[PDB]
Amino acid sequence: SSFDYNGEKVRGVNLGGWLVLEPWITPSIFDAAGAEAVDEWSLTKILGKEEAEARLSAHWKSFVSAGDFQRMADAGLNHVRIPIGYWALGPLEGDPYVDGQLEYLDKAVEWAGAAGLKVLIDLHGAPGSQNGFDNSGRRGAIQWQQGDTVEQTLDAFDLLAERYLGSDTVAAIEAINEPNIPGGVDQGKLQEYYGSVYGIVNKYNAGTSVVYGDGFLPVESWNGFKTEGSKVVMDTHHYHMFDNGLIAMDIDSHIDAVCQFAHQHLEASDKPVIVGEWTGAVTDCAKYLNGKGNGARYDGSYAADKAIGDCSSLATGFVSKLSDEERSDMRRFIEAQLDAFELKSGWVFWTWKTEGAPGWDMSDLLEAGVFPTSPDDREFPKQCHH
Ligand SMILES: OC[C@H]1O[C@@H](O[C@H]2[C@H](O)[C@@H](O)[C@H](O)O[C@@H]2CO)[C@H](O)[C@@H](O)[C@@H]1O
Ligand SMILES: OC[C@H]1O[C@@H](O)[C@H](O)[C@@H](O)[C@@H]1O
Numbered sequence: 591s592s593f594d595y596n597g598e599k600v601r602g603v604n605l606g607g608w609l610v611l612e613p614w615i616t617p618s619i620f621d622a623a624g625a626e627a628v629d630e631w632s633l634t635k636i637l638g639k640e641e642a643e644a645r646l647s648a649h650w651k652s653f654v655s656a657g658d659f660q661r662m663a664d665a666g667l668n669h670v671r672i673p674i675g676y677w678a679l680g681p682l683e684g685d686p687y688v689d690g691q692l693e694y695l696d697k698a699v700e701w702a703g704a705a706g707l708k709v710l711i712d713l714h715g716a717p718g719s720q721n722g723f724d725n726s727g728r729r730g731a732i733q734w735q736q737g738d739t740v741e742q743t744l745d746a747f748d749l750l751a752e753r754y755l756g757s758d759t760v761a762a763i764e765a766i767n768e769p770n771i772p773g774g775v776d777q778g779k780l781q782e783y784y785g786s787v788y789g790i791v792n793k794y795n796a797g798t799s800v801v802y803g804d805g806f807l808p809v810e811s812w813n814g815f816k817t818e819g820s821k822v823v824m825d826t827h828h829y830h831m832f833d834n835g836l837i838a839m840d841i842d843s844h845i846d847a848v849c850q851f852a853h854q855h856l857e858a859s860d861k862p863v864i865v866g867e868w869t870g871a872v873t874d875c876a877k878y879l880n881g882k883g884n885g886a887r888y889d890g891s892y893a894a895d896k897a898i899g900d901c902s903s904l905a906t907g908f909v910s911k912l913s914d915e916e917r918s919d920m921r922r923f924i925e926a927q928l929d930a931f932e933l934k935s936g937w938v939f940w941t942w943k944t945e946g947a948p949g950w951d952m953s954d955l956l957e958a959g960v961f962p963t964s965p966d967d968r969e970f971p972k973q974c975h976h
């Protein structure tokens with residue numbers, strides 16, 4: 591009942607890199623700490639607790655203001671998805687992580703409310719790492735579900751729910767970002783964690799929707815699990831640069847793949863489905879996207895046999911430096927995604943703000959006239975239909 595996921599379209603952005611730092615979103619912060627600083631875990635460990643609190647709190651305070659939220663509303667959005675790590679609820683004994691993020695999430699909920707936006711809180715990192723990505727807090731291993739990690743996840747989730755779910759601004763809360771089933775996360779144990787998260791949400795505020803990631807399975811494979819109308823929302827992430835088939839496509843083929851995704855997957859789900867992450871980029875050229883120290887599929891330097899093209903132009907900077915045809919093709923890709931993802935329950939762009947990652951930065955694309963500001967703001971014919 592906070593938001594009608596069944597009947598109204600989500601139009602959102604992510605605050606990636608804010609309360610869970612990521613090297614590609616703020617490379618300057620990781621590069622200032624040297625070559626071993628490759629994720630939030632290693633960054634805080636290298637700085638130590640005092641200096642980590644100093645540097646990360648300067649970022650938490652400067653990266654987001656009420657003005658960000660006002661600009662999001664002025665762009666036609668109704669949602670903001672906010673990643674937070676388990677360590678924001680108190681680092682475990684021995685973790686290098688610092689806390690303090692809750693003070694800033696508290697401001698976001700107030701600022702979102704003032705701007706007329708809903709907040710979707712996203713538990714983006716779990717003890718042991720649910721995916722092995724740097725964006726979980728610690729790259730290189732999937733240890734979530736070993737030891738007491740799941741109980742520790744539920745302890746953190748419970749504190750987070752207590753603090754926030756009583757606000758009607760917090761319309762929805764996500765169990766865990768990108769639990770990596772193909773990477774070894776056990777689906778049966780994930781479903782048990784999902785059931786416990788639902789129980790937590792309904793202890794405090796039945797009006798708040800529960801959001802479940804598809805775990806990289808087809809989102810329609812979750813049919814028959816917690817099917818409850820507006821109450822339970824699936825979150826699928828749609829990207830064209832992490833797959834060696836999609837990354838080889840031309841712009842027309844990219845647009846075809848987006849419509850095919852909406853028809854085969856979004857329209858096949860028995861629940862509301864948000865595309866809770868997607869972007870304007872069609873390459874993996876952004877500096878450190880595959881991890882600090884790692885290259886790109888697109889130029890043959892990461893997980894690849896051959897270069898498709900060169901990453902010099904798309905690694906860094908802002909879209910004003912590209913050609914008119916490059917900006918035009920990026921907008922065609924974005925409009926196709928807006929229209930395809932609104933066939934089902936809507937969308938949440940990744941991400942609001944970067945240090946310059948062409949096609950990834952909504953605040954950049956909006957100002958450049960690349961990102962549409964309403965469903966009627968279209969420069970190209972509608973590319974996907976019912
Ligand atoms: O999209 C699934 C795919 O991801 C690979 O990890 C990515 C991760 O998804 C991305 O979010 C992060 O920024 O970079 C890494 C490396 O590209 C993963 O290694 C694959 O096994 C998986 O198929
Ligand atoms: O690496 C690109 C993006 O991929 C998504 O799968 C993750 O949830 C983000 O945290 C990340 O920034």
Ligand SMILES: OC[C@H]1O[C@@H](O)[C@H](O)[C@@H](O)[C@@H]1O
Nearest residue numbers: 827828829830831832833851
């Ligand atoms: O690499 C991740 C991608 O792989 C494809 O199988 C899916 O269609 C996308 O939705 C997903 O983002």
Ligand code: NA
Nearest residue numbers: 755757760798
């Ligand atoms: Na709520």
